[PDB]
Amino acid sequence: KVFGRCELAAAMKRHGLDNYRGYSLGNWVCAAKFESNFNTQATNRNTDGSTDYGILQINSRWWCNDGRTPGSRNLCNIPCSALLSSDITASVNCAKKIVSDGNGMNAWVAWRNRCKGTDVQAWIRGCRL
Numbered sequence: 360k361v362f363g364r365c366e367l368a369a370a371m372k373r374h375g376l377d378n379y380r381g382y383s384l385g386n387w388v389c390a391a392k393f394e395s396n397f398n399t400q401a402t403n404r405n406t407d408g409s410t411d412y413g414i415l416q417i418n419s420r421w422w423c424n425d426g427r428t429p430g431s432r433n434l435c436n437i438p439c440s441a442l443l444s445s446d447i448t449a450s451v452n453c454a455k456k457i458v459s460d461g462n463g464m465n466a467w468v469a470w471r472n473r474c475k476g477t478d479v480q481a482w483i484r485g486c487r488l
């Protein structure tokens with residue numbers, strides 16, 4: 360599924376991401392825009408052999424099992440394919456674990472480089488929330 364901006368904002372709000380660990384909703388919508396262009400099916404392979412999955416591009420070396428990232432952990436206890444679903448529940452639940460892990464949203468390179476320190480509330484302007 361390719362979400363609309365406000366559609367995704369509303370879905371993320373319902374799943375408790377607004378102000379989760381202090382990150383306003385706009386941060387999460389911004390991170391999803393630049394990680395995946397709002398496409399739940401996005402995948403990208405990294406040089407270390409791990410793969411990033413889904414709307415928040417969650418990485419298979421630490422967070423999910425895809426059967427081909429040797430010596431990886433599965434800290435979210437889920438197959439990486441669960442993260443590609445049109446239902447964002449699995450991605451959100453896993454992201455909550457990632458963002459609690461100490462480095463905050465800096466775990467998302469696109470958030471660090473393209474969202475951090477910007478006017479992120481712009482990502483939710485015009486949305487009925």
Ligand SMILES: CC(=O)N[C@@H]1[C@@H](O)[C@H](O[C@@H]2O[C@H](CO)[C@@H](O[C@@H]3O[C@H](CO)[C@@H](O)[C@H](O)[C@H]3NC(C)=O)[C@H](O)[C@H]2NC(C)=O)[C@@H](CO)O[C@H]1O
Nearest residue numbers: 411415416417418419420421422457460461462466467468
């Ligand atoms: C969205 C996504 O999948 N992002 C990936 C990043 O998570 C990943 O960076 C490394 O991720 C983990 C968690 O953010 C870090 O491990 C933790 O680091 C803290 C701080 O040092 C430490 O206190 C924790 O105990 C430790 N926990 C565990 C379980 O390991 C790790 O430090 C991150 N970065 C580095 C440079 O090590 C990167 C790199 O694989 O990929 C993203 O896609």
Ligand SMILES: [Cl-]
Nearest residue numbers: 377383384385
């Ligand atoms: Cl907000």
Ligand SMILES: [Cl-]
Nearest residue numbers: 380462463464
């Ligand atoms: Cl933080």
Ligand code: NA
Nearest residue numbers: 419421422423
């Ligand atoms: Na993993």
